[PDB]
Amino acid sequence: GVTQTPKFQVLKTGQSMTLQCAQDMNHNSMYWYRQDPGMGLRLIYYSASEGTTDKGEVPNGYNVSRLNKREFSLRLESAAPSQTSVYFCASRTRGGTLIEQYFGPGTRLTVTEDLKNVFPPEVAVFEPSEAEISHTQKATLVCLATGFYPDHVELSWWVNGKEVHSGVCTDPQPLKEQPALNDSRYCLSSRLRVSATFWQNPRNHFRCQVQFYGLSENDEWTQDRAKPVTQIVSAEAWGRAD
Amino acid sequence: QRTPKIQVYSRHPAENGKSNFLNCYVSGFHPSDIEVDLLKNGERIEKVEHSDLSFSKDWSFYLLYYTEFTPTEKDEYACRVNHVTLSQPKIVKWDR
Amino acid sequence: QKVTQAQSSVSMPVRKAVTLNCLYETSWWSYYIFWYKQLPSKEMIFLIRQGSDEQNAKSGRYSVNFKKAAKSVALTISALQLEDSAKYFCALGEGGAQKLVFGQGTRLTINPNIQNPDPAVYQLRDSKSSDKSVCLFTDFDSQTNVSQSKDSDVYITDKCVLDMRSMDFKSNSAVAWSNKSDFACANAFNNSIIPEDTFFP
Amino acid sequence: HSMRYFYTAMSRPGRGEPRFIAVGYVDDTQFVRFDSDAASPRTEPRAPWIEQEGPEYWDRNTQIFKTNTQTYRESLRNLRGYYNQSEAGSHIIQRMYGCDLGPDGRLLRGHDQSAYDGKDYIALNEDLSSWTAADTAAQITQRKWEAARVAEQLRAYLEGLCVEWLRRYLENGKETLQRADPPKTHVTHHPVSDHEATLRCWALGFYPAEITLTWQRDGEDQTQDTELVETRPAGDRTFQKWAAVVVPSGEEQRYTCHVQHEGLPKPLTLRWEP
Amino acid sequence: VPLTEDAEL
């Protein structure tokens, strides 16, 4: 299919970054699009085949290069906050009817004026209420990931050696903790619901794991607090009969 | 490989002293590369135009080469064609 | 808009059908319409294609009612499943370049059939690692809508559907939390219209 | 009535990238051309009535033919691979396709055929739903086009866009496309022996190109004895043709030239008149 | 108008 790297990226204003795309479907037609929050996708550049980029068709702030038949790159030359967006690559066949575009997984790119706005999540697990257990014979755990910026997280639940999906719901969108601010930090909640008997066994192990994407270990950092690098932040709970 | 058929003719009935068009129609050839000149008394005529490359149901190509001319009694016109199927150019005189 | 989706957000019960509207403008004599859905991961998934020279498209539970003179291409999804919740996009590809023009999308929420509603607000157990108190509103019928807090230091999530597959059991919930010392679950959802029979233990 | 496009793609290793030429016809009237070897290649009109279309028409046709130039480069590479051919040789792909218009104004018959180096390669069957491959290599194309549903794409075009725009062109060019120009005719006579002479029947300045020129002797068609030249362009969008028979001197009065053409109110019967 | 898009052979 279509692959893209990186899936998540934070940049400081003025930084440059190359986004990579590749497709293994023998396609010639490839595309770069961007999607702002709450909007549809808007075309950046259509590359019908290998060849020289038509710079008159490249929007200001970007460089585009079709490297070979498979590979297609989009560079932000000097990143601006207005370029915060999800960048999608796509490709399609030409001829016949099956010409729908196949999308890559996207690059979620956030540009901030100052890397001191970047924070990993704090993660905590809140254990089931005794009242819920006695009212329903079910037990809901809640995981809260709070105070993270950019909104670049992946949350998972792990129980007894397996990443689980049954009984789980995670908010489809993070919430802005301070909606009036452009660099507001974010929160995200998730629920895992199990039977009361499963929760009440202290041999059972529940973990909420949040992969955060932030700075690289090689990045300069002159703030007093710890460098907010890409990292996993987790919280856990073991069952209990009381 | 298919060798060109050649017809040499005027657009209108030729009348000495009256402007007309001299046509060389080459057809039935393959592949498409071909050299066609119209000749006036053995000399190549400049400002000769030709139609857009097309082909027939059997895939063979055809082209019309043409120039405006004014026939006279003694001036001799001809078409000279070279093609990969020909060991030497073929010259076809205009039979008025 | 050159491609306009009429709905911004739609809710529908499981096993019913839903129609999502899309109107477009073009002077091209040849084009296609494509419907996609977008997951929470942001992944974009192709659903169905409608060519300008072809009859109404159908693909499994998806169909397009192509009204070409009206430039209308509404998607209908039949036999709705909980997995159909997603944001749906209508996209126009004109001519040979197929430079897609997207609508702004429609959020589709498929609601479970809560057979035995048991609306309740529970206070969860504190975390020794956190200064927050957490409140869970759960087990309400799908007609209940959850609203954001009137207080800026109280946070409330949208309603979420979970499916306990081992028990064939679905439930709705929303979460509220706050740092404040005067925060009580009894008042956490005061901003919402909640069921009269909500249990507050 | 009919519409046809004729495509020629030619590789030329060492002397540039492959050349792509397209010409379009309504009936026997060429109305557009495109040639990738121009400095800034553009679709151009070749009959006045197509110039009723706006600038967007020309830009869009140019986009399509520029894309075809690239796609046929890939097709040429693919076919070299199918046949294990050297990169040093020159090769040609040709395609002719389009629609014939029925009396109700809908599709009578659709057409789409391709050739490689002047030989049949693959053709859409008359049902517009299946292919005939000429050899093993063309079966590679056939499997790819079956998976890609190319036949469905062509069927929709032939039943839809093709007939829609053919009808538009016929109406826009009605005054020239929908009026037949009858042939101007005469018979000439030239001795070839003491005892034989050539009778030649001429048909000049006619449109469309379809015509029937026949010699009869005592009312019997002389088909196997008749020399017919290929119908040829006059250069003004009309056509010319002649038919000749060698006859015994003294028999000329037994011979009649019969001319059938859409422009004639009734078929003509012509005789040599010295 | 021509076929809007050609397939590779």
Short recap of the structure:
The complex is a heteropentamer of chains A (242), B (96), C (201), D (274) and E (9). Chain B is an all-beta fold and 96 residues long. Chain B is built from no helices and 9 strands.
Could you characterize the architecture of this molecule?
The complex is a heteropentamer of chains A (242), B (96), C (201), D (274) and E (9). Chain A has 242 residues and is mostly beta strands. Helix content of chain A is 5%, strand content 47%. Chain A has two domains: 1-113, Sandwich (Immunoglobulin-like), CATH 2.60.40.10; 114-239, Immunoglobulin-like (Sandwich), CATH 2.60.40. Chain A contains two helices and 19 strands. In chain B, strands 1, 2, 5, 6 and 7 form a five-stranded antiparallel sheet that branches. A four-stranded antiparallel sheet of chain B has the order 4-3-8-9, with no helix packed on it. Chain D is α+β, with helices and mostly antiparallel strands and 274 residues long. Chain D has two domains: 1-179, 2-Layer Sandwich (Murine Class I Major Histocompatibility Complex, H2-DB, Chain A, domain 1); 180-270, Immunoglobulins (Immunoglobulin-like). Chain D is built from five helices and 17 strands. The longest helix of chain D has 28 residues, at 55-82. Chain D is globular. The two termini of chain D are 40 Å apart. Chain E has no helices and no strands. At the A-C interface, strand 4, strand 5, strand 8, strand 9 and strand 11 of A face strand 5, strand 6, strand 10, strand 13 and strand 14 of C. Chain A: Zn(2+) 1 binds at residue 135. Chain A: It is found in: Cell membrane. Chain A: This is Human nkt tcr beta chain.
Using only C-alpha atoms, the radius of gyration of chain E works out to 7 Å
What is the top-level CATH class of chain B? Mainly Beta
Sheet/helix structural class of chain B: mainly beta
CA gyration radius of chain B, whole angstroms:
13 Å
Terminal Cα span of chain E = 21 Å
- Helicity range of the residues of chain B? under 10%
CATH domain topology of chain B: Immunoglobulin-like
The helicity of chain E comes to under 10%
Number of beta-strand segments of chain B: 9
Discrete helix count of chain B: 0
Number of domains of chain B: 1
Total E-strand runs of chain E: 0
Shape verdict of chain B:
globular
| SSE string of chain B | EEEEEEEEE
Tell me the β content of chain E: under 5%
The chain-level structural class of chain E is little secondary structure
Which SSEs are present, and which pair or pack?
The complex is a heteropentamer of chains A (242), B (96), C (201), D (274) and E (9).
Chain B: E1 5-10, E2 20-29, E3 35-40, E4 43-44, E5 49-50, E6 54-55, E7 61-69, E8 77-82, E9 90-93
Chain C: E1 3-5, E2 9-13, E3 18-20, E4 22-24, E5 31-38, E6 44-51, E7 58-59, E8 62-67, E9 72-77, E10 86-94, E11 101-102, E12 106-111, E13 120-123, E14 133-138, E15 154-156, E16 160-164, E17 169-178, H1 185-188
Parallel strand pairs in C: 2-12
Antiparallel strand pairs in C: 1-4, 3-9, 5-6, 5-10, 7-8, 8-9, 10-11, 10-12, 13-14, 14-17, 15-17, 16-17
Chain D: E1 2-10, E2 19-26, E3 29-35, E4 44-45, H1 55-82, E5 92-101, E6 107-116, E7 119-124, E8 131-133, H2 136-148, H3 150-159, H4 161-172, H5 174-177, E9 184-191, E10 196-206, E11 212-217, E12 220-221, E13 227-228, E14 232-233, E15 239-248, E16 255-260, E17 268-270
Antiparallel strand pairs in D: 1-2, 1-5, 2-3, 3-4, 5-6, 6-7, 7-8, 9-10, 10-15, 11-12, 11-16, 13-15, 14-15, 16-17
Helix pairs in contact in D: 3-4
PDB class: immune system
Keywords: agonist, complex, immune system
Assembly: pentameric
